Amino acid sequence: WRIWLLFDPRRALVLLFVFLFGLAIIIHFILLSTSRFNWL
Amino acid sequence: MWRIWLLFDPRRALVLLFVFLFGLAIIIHFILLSTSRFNWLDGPRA
Amino acid sequence: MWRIWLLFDPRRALVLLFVFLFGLAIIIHFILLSTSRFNWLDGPRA
Amino acid sequence: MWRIWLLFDPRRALVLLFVFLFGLAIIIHFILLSTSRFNWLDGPRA
Amino acid sequence: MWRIWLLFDPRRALVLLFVFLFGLAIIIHFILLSTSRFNWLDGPR
Amino acid sequence: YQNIFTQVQVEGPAYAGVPLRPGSSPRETQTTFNYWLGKIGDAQVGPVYLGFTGVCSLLCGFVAIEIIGLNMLASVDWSPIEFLRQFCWLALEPPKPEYGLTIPPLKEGGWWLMAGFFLTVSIALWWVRTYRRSRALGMGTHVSWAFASAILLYLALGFIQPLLMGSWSEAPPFGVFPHLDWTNNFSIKYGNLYYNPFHCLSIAFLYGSALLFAMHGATILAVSRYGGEREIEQMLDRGTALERAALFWRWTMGFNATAESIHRWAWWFAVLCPLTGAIGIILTGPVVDNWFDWGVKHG
Amino acid sequence: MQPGAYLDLAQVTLYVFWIFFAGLLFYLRREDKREGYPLVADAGSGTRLAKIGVPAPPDPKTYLLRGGATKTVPSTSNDRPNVALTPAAPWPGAPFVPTGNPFADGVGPGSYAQRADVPELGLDNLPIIVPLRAAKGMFLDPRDPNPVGMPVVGCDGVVGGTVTEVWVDRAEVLARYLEVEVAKSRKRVLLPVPFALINDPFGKVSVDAIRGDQFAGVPTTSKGDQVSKLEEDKICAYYGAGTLYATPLRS
Amino acid sequence: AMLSFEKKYRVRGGTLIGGDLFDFWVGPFYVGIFGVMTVFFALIGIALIAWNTALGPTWNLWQISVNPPDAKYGLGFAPLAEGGIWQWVSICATGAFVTWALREVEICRKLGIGFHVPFAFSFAIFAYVTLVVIRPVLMGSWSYGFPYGIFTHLDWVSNTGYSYGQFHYNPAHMIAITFFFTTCLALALHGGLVLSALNPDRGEPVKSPEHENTVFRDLVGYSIGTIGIHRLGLFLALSAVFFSAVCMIISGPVLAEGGSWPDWWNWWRNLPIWNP
Amino acid sequence: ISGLSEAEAKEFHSIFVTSFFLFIVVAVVAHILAWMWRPWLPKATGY
Amino acid sequence: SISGLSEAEAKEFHSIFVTSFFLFIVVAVVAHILAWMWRPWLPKATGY
Amino acid sequence: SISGLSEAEAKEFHSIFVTSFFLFIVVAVVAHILAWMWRPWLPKATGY
Amino acid sequence: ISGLSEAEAKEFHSIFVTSFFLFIVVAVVAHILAWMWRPWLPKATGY
Amino acid sequence: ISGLSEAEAKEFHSIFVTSFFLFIVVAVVAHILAWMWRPWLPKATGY
Amino acid sequence: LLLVLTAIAFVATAVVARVLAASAPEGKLYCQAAGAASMVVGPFITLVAAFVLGKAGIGGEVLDATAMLRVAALPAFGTLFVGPVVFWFFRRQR
Numbered sequence A: 001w002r003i004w005l006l007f008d009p010r011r012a013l014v015l016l017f018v019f020l021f022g023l024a025i026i027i028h029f030i031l032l033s034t035s036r037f038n039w040l
Numbered sequence B, C, D: 001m002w003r004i005w006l007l008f009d010p011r012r013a014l015v016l017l018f019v020f021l022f023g024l025a026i027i028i029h030f031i032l033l034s035t036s037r038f039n040w041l042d043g044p045r046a
Numbered sequence E: 001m002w003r004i005w006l007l008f009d010p011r012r013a014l015v016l017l018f019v020f021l022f023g024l025a026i027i028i029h030f031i032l033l034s035t036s037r038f039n040w041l042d043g044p045r
Numbered sequence F: 001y002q003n004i005f006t007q008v009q010v011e012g013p014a015y016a017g018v019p020l021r022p023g024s025s026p027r028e029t030q031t032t033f034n035y036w037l038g039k040i041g042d043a044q045v046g047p048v049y050l051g052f053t054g055v056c057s058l059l060c061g062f063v064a065i066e067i068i069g070l071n072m073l074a075s076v077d078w079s080p081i082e083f084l085r086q087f088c089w090l091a092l093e094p095p096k097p098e099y100g101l102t103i104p105p106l107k108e109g110g111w112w113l114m115a116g117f118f119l120t121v122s123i124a125l126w127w128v129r130t131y132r133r134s135r136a137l138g139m140g141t142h143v144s145w146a147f148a149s150a151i152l153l154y155l156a157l158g159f160i161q162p163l164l165m166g167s168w169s170e171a172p173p174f175g176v177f178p179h180l181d182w183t184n185n186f187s188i189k190y191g192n193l194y195y196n197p198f199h200c201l202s203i204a205f206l207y208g209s210a211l212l213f214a215m216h217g218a219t220i221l222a223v224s225r226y227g228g229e230r231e232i233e234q235m236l237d238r239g240t241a242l243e244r245a246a247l248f249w250r251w252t253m254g255f256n257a258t259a260e261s262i263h264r265w266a267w268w269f270a271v272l273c274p275l276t277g278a279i280g281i282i283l284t285g286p287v288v289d290n291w292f293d294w295g296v297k298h299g
Numbered sequence G: 001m002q003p004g005a006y007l008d009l010a011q012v013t014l015y016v017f018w019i020f021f022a023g024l025l026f027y028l029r030r031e032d033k034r035e036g037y038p039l040v041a042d043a044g045s046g047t048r049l050a051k052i053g054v055p056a057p058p059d060p061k062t063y064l065l066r067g068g069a070t071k072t073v074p075s076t077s078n079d080r081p082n083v084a085l086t087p088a089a090p091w092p093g094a095p096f097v098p099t100g101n102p103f104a105d106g107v108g109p110g111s112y113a114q115r116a117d118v119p120e121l122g123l124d125n126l127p128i129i130v131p132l133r134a135a136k137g138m139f140l141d142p143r144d145p146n147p148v149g150m151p152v153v154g155c156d157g158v159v160g161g162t163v164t165e166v167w168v169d170r171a172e173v174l175a176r177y178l179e180v181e182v183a184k185s186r187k188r189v190l191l192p193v194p195f196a197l198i199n200d201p202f203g204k205v206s207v208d209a210i211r212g213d214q215f216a217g218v219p220t221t222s223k224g225d226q227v228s229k230l231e232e233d234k235i236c237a238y239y240g241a242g243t244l245y246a247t248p249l250r251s
Numbered sequence H: 001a002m003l004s005f006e007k008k009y010r011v012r013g014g015t016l017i018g019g020d021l022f023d024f025w026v027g028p029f030y031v032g033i034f035g036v037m038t039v040f041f042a043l044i045g046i047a048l049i050a051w052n053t054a055l056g057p058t059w060n061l062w063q064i065s066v067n068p069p070d071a072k073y074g075l076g077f078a079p080l081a082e083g084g085i086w087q088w089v090s091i092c093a094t095g096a097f098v099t100w101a102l103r104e105v106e107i108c109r110k111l112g113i114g115f116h117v118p119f120a121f122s123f124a125i126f127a128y129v130t131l132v133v134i135r136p137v138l139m140g141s142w143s144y145g146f147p148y149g150i151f152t153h154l155d156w157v158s159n160t161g162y163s164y165g166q167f168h169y170n171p172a173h174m175i176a177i178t179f180f181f182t183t184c185l186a187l188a189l190h191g192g193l194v195l196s197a198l199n200p201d202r203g204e205p206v207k208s209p210e211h212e213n214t215v216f217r218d219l220v221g222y223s224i225g226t227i228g229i230h231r232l233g234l235f236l237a238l239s240a241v242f243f244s245a246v247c248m249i250i251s252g253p254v255l256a257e258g259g260s261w262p263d264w265w266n267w268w269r270n271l272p273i274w275n276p
Numbered sequence I, L, M: 001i002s003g004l005s006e007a008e009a010k011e012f013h014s015i016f017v018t019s020f021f022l023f024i025v026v027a028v029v030a031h032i033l034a035w036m037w038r039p040w041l042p043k044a045t046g047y
Numbered sequence J, K: 001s002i003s004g005l006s007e008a009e010a011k012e013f014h015s016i017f018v019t020s021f022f023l024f025i026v027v028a029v030v031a032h033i034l035a036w037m038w039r040p041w042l043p044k045a046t047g048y
Numbered sequence N: 001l002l003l004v005l006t007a008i009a010f011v012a013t014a015v016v017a018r019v020l021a022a023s024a025p026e027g028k029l030y031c032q033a034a035g036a037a038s039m040v041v042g043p044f045i046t047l048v049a050a051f052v053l054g055k056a057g058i059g060g061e062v063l064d065a066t067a068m069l070r071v072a073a074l075p076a077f078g079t080l081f082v083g084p085v086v087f088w089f090f091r092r093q094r
């Protein structure tokens, strides 16, 4: 809750969501880069 | 050292530090992954 | 020598010093990684 | 000679001098590192 | 000859003279360094 | 709404223009209004002052164009059918190498030499006309000195570099596709023009002029709602429009121009494109004959 | 240098150009600093010495005007330094918040410059922006729609007034302002053409920057057949304020 | 710090995302969320370029080159040391350009002006994307993108042009060159005209837009005016870039790679009007 | 600061930590599945 | 102050900041121990 | 009047600055000693 | 008086001179060590 | 005019001449050392 | 065949997106874990569906883990998109 005295969640949440989505995309593309983990 | 927060606003300094740390982590992970010895996904070129 | 902070804003000076030190450290690390003798990731053939 | 500070803003002159000194230092270091004899990382074969 | 500083602002004149001097010194050093006789880093070869 | 077009176009009398100094002649009186011109810009299509230098410039230029066209017609046996078929491939070719800098036979570069002479005289007369049209209104001669840069590139291409090489055969032909082929073979014959540094600089300044004129046009259209297009008045008496433009660019990239210095930036980029071009052409062959070898020698 | 040397004419010419071009960039960046200097230091900065930058601004430049008059730039009197704004935070770089009504204060997108309170005289020493009733010989070119008569409507759909006259620029034939008889107070206010959609979408001309009632607050010109540069900035600024501060409850 | 007149405009609001978290300035620069993102992308890209150079033979600035993947990888992700760094530098670059355009949009909203500058920048972004994404995808492998090197992407331009005979005969390319040369001409003309009116001959007053109209008439034949010139300049630059992008799209996806642009023009020489 | 009460901070923090731990559980299960598919971190020779 | 924090609030924030920084450092340390157990870096002048 | 601060503020900031700078330099010196133990630089004119 | 007073100029200049001198002596030590490592200025035939 | 009184002018000029002269002396010593290291100006047959 | 058959993924994603679009308690929870969860719940749905219908051979064939992953990739990717657009009817309700 102490973090919520900063970073009012009405805007510090969609940023976290796009960050998580971007990180997931980066890791998936890194996996597709390899041969062992290219699941296609 | 607590005096550093009389100079810099903690919200923006904290968010900027987080962006910096994430970028540094991304770069070090890429650098490790580009080598042969530290490619933890495919292993060495052999 | 404390008089320097009567010349320069210590806040802006602190941020500039941080940026400059980080840039220099990154430059030196990349220089070493480009050499063969001091590359510490893959090793002595580069 | 101290009168030169009645002409030039000492903050601006001093940051100019620091930028110039750092630029000259990295330029001389890079020049030496590009030669074979004075390269101190890989050594004399360059 | 002191009257030249009535013609030109000593600040601008002095900055311009310093820029000129440093540029000329750099150019002469690089010219010498590009020759084979006067290259003091690697030497005549 | 944005100012790409004018919604309401007012129409009134034809403007005769600013009265001139007592050193010119009465100008034309065409002063017609085209609707689409006013749609994209202003609508008046006159009156074009055409004095001595303008008339002699057009006469010399049309002498050159007549020579070129009659040679392209003769090279095709006067067939208008074959002229229309082969038009983009026809050219008055430069003299042969065996003639050096002499006046060669007409069919072996004499006609080319005469057309080039008359085109150069036409272009110099047009430059003099720009100079006089500016200084007859009391204005600066910045446009004339921007034109002089293009003229310097054109002279280097057709006159100066052929001089320093000692042969008119170095110069371009007078034809569309043939002068494209000349450009290509010039790059091929002298190494690779991508390793000519002044060629790199000329390309930098051409790209930068495109970039700068996109930036400036977009900036003026963005603040045109605040009266931004009146640049002279916004410089003499700064309004909120030029303040907003300066602030846009200062917040975007950290630095901005004024209403006048942006046009100095523009002038200098556009001028440095053909200046560096002319230098790089004068260097290509008299000084450097293989640019890739030079680049390897340096980087 | 000599044919075999590492130094040759091409690279000497290139370094000559690099020197000339560094000098030219300095000169251009110096010309850029003829307005807006010295800098205004922000919170936490010593204000004793001026902030200018590494190309210092040049000496003030003096332009000669037609009637023997004279204008020296920078136009420091146009700055409006102190306005109705308060810092949203004590740290440097923090934005400001309008303390009062940003339409009347002239802050943010609604800011204007303290221009000369006199019209532009063009070439014949007469105001160039004039009502069509005052510029005889010009006409609206009926090829396009005629704004006059159309009642102007706000952004929230409320009719604001009626278009009475079209103000045009002389010697650059162009419509600059629409005169608007406000709704029911018998007052005429100017409306910049770029801030209006004079197309007759349905029957009228529509302005989406401010809403219908706000046409009462548009800054009025002191004369009737001429508008000064100051009033020009004030009107365009009143309309620009709506781009950020009106949003007439159209949600 | 601020310009002497800037304080009026440094107001809160006008952002797209994030609210007031990034609504501030760092010196001259406005930050916004997209400014942080742009610096992030630019710095990750520059660091990947530096790393690719550290793996390479030289630090020479002219010979630095981040090369695209081999054609054997087609349109898939290549290993990081065999072309993947190029793909990631490309992703970082397109991210940087897009967030830069968006930050310009935010600044436009905060100042209350039109969005012509981000719109015009989108054309350069589109040309870059055509070069590194659209064209190699249409041609089936990332090996058709240009290498990120000061003088190796010039070699790429040379090889790409010469693979179609002589690239000068590319018609969209001729149109694009005409537009670029006209843009440079118009920039010189406009700059010189405004500088002539503002800095006149000795003893003369600052001239008016009427003198500019007069001299522009005497040179080009007619007049476009103060807003027409900026419109025409925007249009010329944007159409130059658009026809460059078209030029590149039609060569390799449309005209085969080993094709000939000089030979494509024979359709005109071979018309029945004059062929037999 | 932020216009968020201490009590409102705690009441949002409740659902925040719950959905955060739900996300963590799903990620951990996805990783167990991925490892059972193909393990990573080989030895200096290979898999 | 410049940031607008009273020294009470500055000290309060700094306590949590150093706590978080030290937890971050401890996690990074165990991560580096694990990474070394997987692949040691810093080879000999001849190689690994 | 000075460029921003008072001698009290300047001296306080300088105390903290010198402490931080000294510990930063000490860490750097330890780093360089370890680096030299791993790989000495500055070879002879013939090589290593 | 392009910004400063006489006293401030003298104080700044004294500090500037002493720190410039410290910079010079540190650089002289640096060059003595560099020369001990590898001398420059070869003979006209080489090293 | 540069906005400088003749007293300021003479002061600046005296200091400038002193500085220029010290610079010349240093440059002369440098050129003597350089000549001792490598003489330029060969004969028409070379060094 | 399984590929075009695995529209179980799309319909189940539409179902869960409709559910959480109706069950989104308050406003501005679209910007919250309603549209976001509607995006990521999809690939898990298609994963479990492919796992259940690849063991039980439906396309006349039984698949491994690798073959099942290669097959179910594209439905997962299209589901990553069909989630949010089906959920968007939440805000399209109010």
Ligand code: BCL
Pocket (backbone or CB within 6 Å): C017, C019, C020, C021, C022, C023, C024, C028, D018, D019, D021, D022, D025, D032, D038, D040, K042, L023, L026, L027, L028, L030, L031, L034
């Ligand atoms: C033969 C080569 C020898 C060597 C022989 C010498 C000799 C001889 C000398 C040095 C000197 C120096 N050497 Mg050594 N040195 C060697 C190897 C190194 C290595 C290395 C990684 O190997 C490093 C890091 C150094 C570093 C140094 C510096 C401590 C010092 C440079 C002076 C200076 O910093 O001016 C810069 C001074 C400033 C005040 C600049 C301050 C910058 C400020 C803060 C603002 C800059 C803003 C900046 C532009 C912002 C952008 C930053 C970027 C992001 C990076 N050397 C090798 C072994 N070295 C010199 C010295 O000791 O001088 C005292 C010297 O004379």
Ligand code: BCL
Pocket (backbone or CB within 6 Å): F065, F119, F123, F150, F151, F153, F154, F157, F174, F183, F184, F185, F186, F187, F188, F192, F193, F194, F198, F199, F202, F203, F204, F206, F273, F274, F276, F277, F278, F280, F281, H157, H181, H184
């Ligand atoms: C295979 C081809 C070669 C090449 C060979 C050359 C050659 C040769 C030249 C150039 C030149 C240029 N090249 Mg190149 N160039 C190449 C690749 C490129 C690429 C690219 C993306 O690859 C680009 C962007 C460019 C761009 C450029 C320009 C920067 C530059 C032209 C300046 C200019 O504005 O001229 C426009 C201005 C003029 C042409 C002169 C103005 C003409 C006069 C003033 C107007 C008279 C009109 C007349 C009166 C009308 C009636 C006449 C009658 C009808 C006849 N080149 C490759 C490497 N390039 C020129 C240059 O300067 O480089 C050093 C040049 O000479």
Ligand SMILES: CC[C@H]1c2cc3[nH]c4c(c3C)C(=O)[C@H](C(=O)OC)c4c3nc(cc4[nH]c(cc(n2)[C@@H]1C)c(C(C)=O)c4C)[C@@H](C)[C@@H]3CCC(=O)OC/C=C(\C)CCC[C@@H](C)CCC[C@@H](C)CCCC(C)C
Pocket (backbone or CB within 6 Å): F057, F058, F060, F061, F062, F065, F119, F122, F123, F126, F127, F130, F143, F144, F146, F147, F148, F149, F150, F270, F271, F273, F274, H181, H182, H184, H185, H188, H189, H219, H220
């Ligand atoms: C800053 C450098 C750029 C530049 C600048 C520039 N050009 C200029 C000027 C300036 C500042 C003028 O003031 C002058 C002018 O009058 O502009 C309207 C001009 C000019 N630049 C012109 C052309 C031109 N500029 C070119 C290039 C450039 N000009 C550079 C990119 C090119 C190219 C790229 O090839 C051309 C073809 C003319 C329109 C004009 C000079 C007119 C002239 O000298 O007339 C001589 C008279 C005759 C030859 C008689 C016949 C006239 C007609 C043939 C005119 C046709 C014009 C045009 C349609 C030709 C196009 C090519 C043809 C092959 C179809």
Ligand SMILES: CC(C)C/C=C/[C@H](C)C/C=C/[C@@H](C)CCC[C@H](C)CCCC[C@@H](C)CCC[C@H](C)CCC[C@@H](C)CCCC(C)(C)O
Pocket (backbone or CB within 6 Å): F065, F066, F068, F069, F070, F073, F113, F115, F116, F117, F119, F120, F154, F155, F157, F158, F159, F171, F172, F173, F174, F175, F176, F179
């Ligand atoms: C004593 C000597 C030594 C002095 C002379 C010395 C001079 C100084 C020489 C200088 C010569 C140099 C400077 C010239 C440079 C050459 C130019 C760079 C040309 C390059 C580009 C040219 C083409 C793109 C244009 C060709 C024209 C067009 C294709 C044809 C037009 C003709 C027909 C259509 C007219 C239809 C008409 C009909 C026949 C119907 O009636």
Ligand SMILES: CCCCCCCCCCCCO[C@@H]1O[C@H](CO)[C@@H](O[C@H]2O[C@H](CO)[C@@H](O)[C@H](O)[C@H]2O)[C@H](O)[C@H]1O
Pocket (backbone or CB within 6 Å): F155, F160, F163, F164, F165, F166, F167
């Ligand atoms: C209008 C623009 C400015 C006016 C003109 C600018 C140049 C004026 C001076 C030109 C000087 C003559 O320049 C000189 O030309 C002669 C012949 O022409 C060349 O002389 C030689 O050129 C080449 C060398 O391989 C051969 O063709 C031949 O052996 C010989 O002609 C010189 O190499 C050149 O230096």
Ligand SMILES: CCCCCCCCCCCCO[C@@H]1O[C@H](CO)[C@@H](O[C@H]2O[C@H](CO)[C@@H](O)[C@H](O)[C@H]2O)[C@H](O)[C@H]1O
Pocket (backbone or CB within 6 Å): A024, A025, A028, A029, A032, A040, H073, H074, H075, H076, H077, H140, H141, N077
């Ligand atoms: C929550 C985030 C989840 C992110 C999930 C990641 C989704 C997958 C990203 C798309 C990756 C596709 O990756 C790539 O796609 C192209 C486009 O068809 C495939 O197809 C391509 O095959 C060959 C080369 O492989 C090309 O010559 C051909 O023209 C093209 O069809 C590639 O073989 C595949 O390697």
Ligand SMILES: [Fe+3]
Pocket (backbone or CB within 6 Å): F216, F220, F231, F263, H190, H194, H230
């Ligand atoms: Fe303009």
